[PDB]
Amino acid sequence: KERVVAAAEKGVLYVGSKTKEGVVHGVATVAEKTKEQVTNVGGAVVTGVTAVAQKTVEGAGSIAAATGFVKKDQL
């Protein structure tokens, strides 16, 4: 009776050569969370799907993916 489903069915030179490099392809979740509670106080709470597909994050002191990150640096 009750049914839930998720389907994701699908100098440098490239001479006649296929490349995919950085790429998120298939993410099926079908999540179910009854009676969910979240109480964040000055932090970071992540309870969902995330798909980061960066290719170049060149840079000193940088951050590529800052999920659920809590940065409290001092001096």
Author numbering: 12 to 21, 36 to 100
Paper text:
Mutations and multiplications in the SNCA gene, encoding alpha-synuclein (aSyn), are associated with familial forms of Parkinson’s disease (PD). aSyn, an intrinsically disordered protein, has been a significant focus of neuroscience research not only due to its central role in PD and related synucleinopathies, but also because of its abundance and function in the nervous system. aSyn is primarily concentrated in the presynaptic terminals of neurons, but is also present in other cellular compartments including the nucleus, and is thought to interact with membranes adopting helical conformations and tetrameric structures. In pathological conditions, aSyn is thought to misfold and accumulate, forming pathological aggregates that disrupt cellular homeostasis, in a process that may ultimately cause neuronal cell death. A central pathological hallmark in PD and other synucleinopathies is the accumulation of aSyn into insoluble aggregates.
Consistently, our group has recently described the novel variant G14R, that is associated with an atypical, rapidly progressive phenotype and widespread neuronal loss in combination with frontotemporal lobar degeneration-associated aSyn pathology. Interestingly, the effects of the K58N mutation are opposite to those we recently reported for the G14R mutation, which strongly favors 1PF forms.
